[PDB]
Amino acid sequence: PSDLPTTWQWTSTGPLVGPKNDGRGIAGIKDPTIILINGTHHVFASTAQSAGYNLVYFTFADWADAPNATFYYLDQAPLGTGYRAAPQVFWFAPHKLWYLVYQNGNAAYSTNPDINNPKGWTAPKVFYPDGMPKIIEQNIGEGYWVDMWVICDSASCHLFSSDDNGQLYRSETSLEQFPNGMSQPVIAMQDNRNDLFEAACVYSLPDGKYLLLVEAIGTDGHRWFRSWTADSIRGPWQGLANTEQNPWARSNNVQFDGDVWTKSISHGEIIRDGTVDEKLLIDPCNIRFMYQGMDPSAGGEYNALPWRLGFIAHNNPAC
Length: 319
Ligand SMILES: [Ca+2]
Prior knowledge:
It holds the Pfam family Glyco_hydro_62. The protein is mostly beta strands. It has one helix and 21 strands. The protein has a single domain, classed as Glycosyl hydrolase domain, family 43 (Tachylectin-2, Chain A). The protein is 2% helix and 41% strand. The strands form five sheets. A five-stranded mixed sheet has the order 18-1-21-20-19, with no helix packed on it. It has a four-stranded antiparallel sheet with strand order 2-3-4-5, with no helix packed on it. A four-stranded antiparallel sheet has the order 6-7-8-9, with no helix packed on it. A hairpin with a 3-residue loop joins strand 7 (97-103) and strand 8. Bound molecules: calcium ion (CA).
């Protein structure tokens, strides 16, 4: 793709979004999905603690207002209590409904006619009503079925997911059938688990190509992103910036404006503006990526790690 560089450089904010002192005991705010509508950002994120995961909505105009944005917990909607994590939001234009895609042990979705109403999200329905696909059971190993992502073109809608074991899965259905009818997935891409771990993003580009981002665990133990491009959602995928020396986003290509608050660059999303619909279009000339990070000296149980959200802004746009 002509308007993407092969090497990437970023500037990061400080940690802007963390847990509230509200009695819920949340340790981390994680895995954001973010869209921008006429100056207003809308975010959904995981709440993480060792007792479980659920979902939160918040909104702000300027990024400086993110730290004080009110949290609207989606367990107050019909979406409800239970396990829910790692959301993706988009407008599905055929239905004139927003969709929120997330995991619950299966691949799930909720709908809402108005993104501004966090109480409006439906109880989950599942993309795979017969349970975990056999292909994922055969390949998951000691992993977990995570990180659900939809992208459609004008004919077909695809559902991507990971197993924390080095597979990236893809199912499809027609545009007209969505959300129903998802195929049994194929393995879209496969690597060793640390090199193709979780947190996929699949975007469309104004030149009609596609961008795939996947989170990886580096030799130093810290999270980073690898990238590929393709002419089809179905692949094949060509490496863009997918090595530690030439990463999509990693400690070695992110400059901090203040303190270096994280070494991991982990589960995030590009800010989508303009159309915020099912085609998951981005503007390659103005990429900003909301991400999660943490104090690199912290340890302990994964679910209680002190994940916070910031932004990286792309320094070297190619258009
Ligand atoms: Ca995600």
